[PDB]
Design a protein around this ligand. Sequence first.
Ligand SMILES: CCN(CC)c1ccc2c(c1)Oc1cc(N(CC)CC)ccc1C2c1ccccc1C(=O)OCCOCCOCCn1cc(CO[C@H]2O[C@H](CO)[C@@H](O)[C@H](O)[C@H]2O)nn1
Ligand SMILES: CCN(CC)c1ccc2c(c1)Oc1cc(N(CC)CC)ccc1C2c1ccccc1C(=O)OCCOCCOCCn1cc(CO[C@H]2O[C@H](CO)[C@@H](O)[C@H](O)[C@H]2O)nn1
Ligand SMILES: CCN(CC)c1ccc2c(c1)Oc1cc(N(CC)CC)ccc1C2c1ccccc1C(=O)OCCOCCOCCn1cc(CO[C@H]2O[C@H](CO)[C@@H](O)[C@H](O)[C@H]2O)nn1
Ligand SMILES: CCN(CC)c1ccc2c(c1)Oc1cc(N(CC)CC)ccc1C2c1ccccc1C(=O)OCCOCCOCCn1cc(CO[C@H]2O[C@H](CO)[C@@H](O)[C@H](O)[C@H]2O)nn1
Ligand SMILES: [Ca+2]
Ligand SMILES: [Ca+2]
Ligand SMILES: [Ca+2]
Ligand SMILES: [Ca+2]
Ligand SMILES: [Mn+2]
Ligand SMILES: [Mn+2]
Ligand SMILES: [Mn+2]
Ligand SMILES: [Mn+2]
Lengths: 237, 237, 237, 237
Amino acid sequence: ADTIVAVELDTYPNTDIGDPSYPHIGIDIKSVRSKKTAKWNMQNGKVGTAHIIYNSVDKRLSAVVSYPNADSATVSYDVDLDNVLPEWVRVGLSASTGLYKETNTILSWSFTSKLKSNSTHETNALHFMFNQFSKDQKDLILQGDATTGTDGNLELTRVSSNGSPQGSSVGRALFYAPVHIWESSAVVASFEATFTFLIKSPDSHPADGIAFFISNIDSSIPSGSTGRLLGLFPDAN
Amino acid sequence: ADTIVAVELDTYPNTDIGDPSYPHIGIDIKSVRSKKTAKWNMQNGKVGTAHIIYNSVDKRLSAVVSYPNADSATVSYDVDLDNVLPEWVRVGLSASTGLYKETNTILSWSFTSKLKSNSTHETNALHFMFNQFSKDQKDLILQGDATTGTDGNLELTRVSSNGSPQGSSVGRALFYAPVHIWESSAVVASFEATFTFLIKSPDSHPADGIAFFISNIDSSIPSGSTGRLLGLFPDAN
Amino acid sequence: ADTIVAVELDTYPNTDIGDPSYPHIGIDIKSVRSKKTAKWNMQNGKVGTAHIIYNSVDKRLSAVVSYPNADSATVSYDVDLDNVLPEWVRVGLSASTGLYKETNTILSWSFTSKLKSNSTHETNALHFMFNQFSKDQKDLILQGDATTGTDGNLELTRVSSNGSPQGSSVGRALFYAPVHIWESSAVVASFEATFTFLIKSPDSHPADGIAFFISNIDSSIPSGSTGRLLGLFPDAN
Amino acid sequence: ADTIVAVELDTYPNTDIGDPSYPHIGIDIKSVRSKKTAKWNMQNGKVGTAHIIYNSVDKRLSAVVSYPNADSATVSYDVDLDNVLPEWVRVGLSASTGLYKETNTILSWSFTSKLKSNSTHETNALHFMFNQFSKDQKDLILQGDATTGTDGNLELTRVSSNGSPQGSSVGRALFYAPVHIWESSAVVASFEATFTFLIKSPDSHPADGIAFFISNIDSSIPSGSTGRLLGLFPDAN
Ligand SMILES: CCN(CC)c1ccc2c(c1)Oc1cc(N(CC)CC)ccc1C2c1ccccc1C(=O)OCCOCCOCCn1cc(CO[C@H]2O[C@H](CO)[C@@H](O)[C@H](O)[C@H]2O)nn1
Ligand SMILES: CCN(CC)c1ccc2c(c1)Oc1cc(N(CC)CC)ccc1C2c1ccccc1C(=O)OCCOCCOCCn1cc(CO[C@H]2O[C@H](CO)[C@@H](O)[C@H](O)[C@H]2O)nn1
Ligand SMILES: CCN(CC)c1ccc2c(c1)Oc1cc(N(CC)CC)ccc1C2c1ccccc1C(=O)OCCOCCOCCn1cc(CO[C@H]2O[C@H](CO)[C@@H](O)[C@H](O)[C@H]2O)nn1
Ligand SMILES: CCN(CC)c1ccc2c(c1)Oc1cc(N(CC)CC)ccc1C2c1ccccc1C(=O)OCCOCCOCCn1cc(CO[C@H]2O[C@H](CO)[C@@H](O)[C@H](O)[C@H]2O)nn1
Ligand SMILES: [Ca+2]
Ligand SMILES: [Ca+2]
Ligand SMILES: [Ca+2]
Ligand SMILES: [Ca+2]
Ligand SMILES: [Mn+2]
Ligand SMILES: [Mn+2]
Ligand SMILES: [Mn+2]
Ligand SMILES: [Mn+2]
């Protein structure tokens, strides 16, 4: 059973699992049923930016999702990630389709993590940046339908050769090195992740959306987690 | 009159102007009467570390002051820095003594400021790092009694040739370049400052403390701001 | 008399002052007559990129200029910058027009400088990044005709309200803080500079070019330095 | 067998395999017999620093090793690394002892790699920093005798419970994620690595050394590569 903390850009309302009745961003703590959601005006066909941030002083996980010249969507949840996640994790991106579909393309992805210890306050840091993805991206672990290199992008779910998306798809990309997201003797620890994404659907109704996630290091796509489950969770609980 | 936002490490309780009964860290918004303080166990003669952080999403100014192997002191305050400070600022370190005294020695200082715009989501960033100060530190604006180069440290208040700190001293170092801490169309702005310091006193009661501050670009040490005013405020209101 | 080190992007061959017969890049060490040049196929109207890098171990100043999908032009020169520059400098961008003309438009600028001392191996660093410029960009020093804000770009030379570049123009933007590009007791000092540019001319022959430069902190545009002099040298010697 | 590019800090003169007559640093291109060496006055028991850098414009691999207040040892070799190494590598630290011995203690390790592609000039970056190592350091592959966490240091070779270095020991630490050190379509690609070390020995002649290396990703310690082989090479050819 994986341990998942995620920020979801949820394009499709599943009101039967507590989704609000509109597209929304959310913070997910070991459940697809979001602890905090905000309305998000997803723009079919457009490049947007997501920013996710946390530090161990405020213990507050926050995300802003944005398109140029539009009002941002913002969401925040108070949570001690020390109590939720293991000491070492992987970080990734996840996306799915179900009966409705959309391209879940990633154009760029960056991440930064820093830990200062309570004994002689030495800082350990990790930073990665992808502004292009190649056919053979050896520092990503690609799971399920995820592919890299088409146009120099990361396509999290299946795209057919004519460029339209497919339903019932799920895939994820995880950064290869494990990440130390907390330590018991840290003065401050923090992270920030940003990615740019392009969600396009020929349907009237896109689905199912994209997530930034932090998981146990050995995490994999739960069985049957296409659709509303976003590649993250084994069920809707 | 200057506009001051500061994180104070207040070594001396002036209860007649609202200080708690004990050395305390605090967040100062345009006043020396902090908006929020927490108890701080200052350690005479030991090198400690301070970290200050803010971002435009949570709008929450937060600091942690620490010594190796001790419990941290932590303090936070909800505040929209957009509403308080001008678009352009200087960032700086400040310290004073009064009728009681201490060294106000800075061994390192770093600062990172980031803004991503709402118009195609381009990032502007400033970073500086001092892990040693030379006698001619041209990218530091030194005010009052502040000097650089002695042992490679920044001494914010006057220290005599024999190492002894002097009373009635006030001194400040501001980074040379102005800094853009907000813009009306930034999706996320954030900053982070760190410094190491060494407060030592031959007195029973050290005074008066060290502050990291953000100010209008033309800020200078207000008149008679030695002692309890920490080099920051013209008065005690 | 100023002391300039510079990387020139020279759009206009002035063979009377030792320019080669074609648009070219070059390294200039206290003279507009380049110590080294290489052929540069400038592309009228196209967004280009330049990179300048140097380190105190190799003592080699090297620059690459390129457009997406073209062969890069590269040039390098063996010079000990400690021998040439004062210890504190400013960094900047300069451009000019003369009887012929072009827009000298800067769309992004970044610079990182790092010094490690011979005792006790402590690093000082400076980093800045401009991915957009605003109307009042207080951390740039503008000289001559240079302005910021139109479209979020830095226009180093005069452009008219209608978009047309003007003859006989010259301007520079220097970053506000002086920079420590060297110190006597350094294990290693280095820097890198990147900028993107857009040179468009309605003339059959574009003039005069853009340079990245490093100078005495108190550099100004030498008088009459339009055209072939590039905002940089008082004469063609 | 493996493809290795290394910077050796070589404490023991093995004159039978072309080592010079004195402790030295060298650049190793697929052979233990360095393509260039410089004289290194290793200091028994004192914390040193090494810096290695390379960029694809100069195609010069260079290194500096120093102690506070000493003259530096520096060595360089003109080598085009995309000609030698595969497109994907891992970076690491290696060390060995044989009949004679020393502690190979790593106190800190940082690394930054960067690639700008020839289309659309997009940057890919990796950065890691260890200023402490814990007992369970999941983002390092440890091979052979290497251990982490004792005093927060990485011990590349065996040390017994009482601090005493052991003979016939070989160990390495690789960063976990693969690193993209060249791309055929790259404007400029570069890296820099820094480590701090403490080499301490009871022997009249300390042995054998520490290396920074870059290898095929699936590299392991070659068979019998203790002593003069430095845990890097299967033989001394
Ligand atoms: C009333 C709320 N609502 C709309 C928001 C809704 C409800 C039912 C369907 C809906 C939508 O859509 C479809 C669409 C299709 N197709 C695409 C046009 C053909 C493939 C077919 C059927 C329906 C059905 C459907 C009809 C009858 C029987 C079963 C289903 C069904 O979805 O059953 C599967 C599991 O659902 C069980 C009950 O769930 C009721 C909630 N409902 C169901 C859905 C669609 O859900 C699927 O698609 C979603 C979008 O990709 C994913 O998030 C889900 O993981 C996936 O199961 N949305 N809301
Ligand atoms: C060499 C001189 N020396 C150092 C040993 C010294 C001298 C005088 C005092 C000293 C110390 O201490 C105190 C302390 C207190 N209290 C301790 C918390 C509270 C009972 C009180 C009086 C003295 C006084 C004092 C007594 C009588 C008359 C005036 C003062 C006085 O402080 O004159 C100058 C301004 O004082 C006006 C009245 O202030 C009431 C607050 N009181 C006074 C002080 C000392 O304050 C001075 O020193 C502080 C510490 O550096 C600074 O923060 C202040 O800005 C600075 O003005 N602290 N609390
Ligand atoms: C390129 C076309 N050409 C060559 C046929 C040419 C063009 C202009 C002049 C020219 C020649 O010559 C003179 C000569 C004189 N005198 C004779 C020596 C004085 C009696 C006076 C004016 C002009 C001028 C002149 C007259 C009126 C206004 C301006 C100029 C001029 O800029 O002139 C700059 C001086 O050029 C002299 C010869 O140089 C040959 C190189 N070539 C290139 C240019 C254009 O030069 C200007 O424009 C260039 C491109 O922007 C800049 O790089 C230069 O720095 C700037 O001086 N001019 N010639
Ligand atoms: C430095 C002092 N020296 C020269 C006087 C010397 C030291 C040891 C031997 C030496 C010589 O010679 C031999 C010779 C043999 N034989 C005949 C060739 C076989 C019967 C056997 C053992 C020893 C050994 C030996 C004895 C006991 C345990 C190990 C060894 C050994 O490693 O020995 C490696 C011997 O290499 C042959 C001679 O090499 C001359 C160089 N000399 C030998 C060494 C020891 O080298 C070991 O230690 C070095 C330092 O750690 C490492 O760089 C080497 O990788 C590691 O093999 N260093 N310098
Ligand atoms: Ca949903
Ligand atoms: Ca006080
Ligand atoms: Ca020219
Ligand atoms: Ca050797
Ligand atoms: Mn949801
Ligand atoms: Mn106070
Ligand atoms: Mn030229
Ligand atoms: Mn050797």
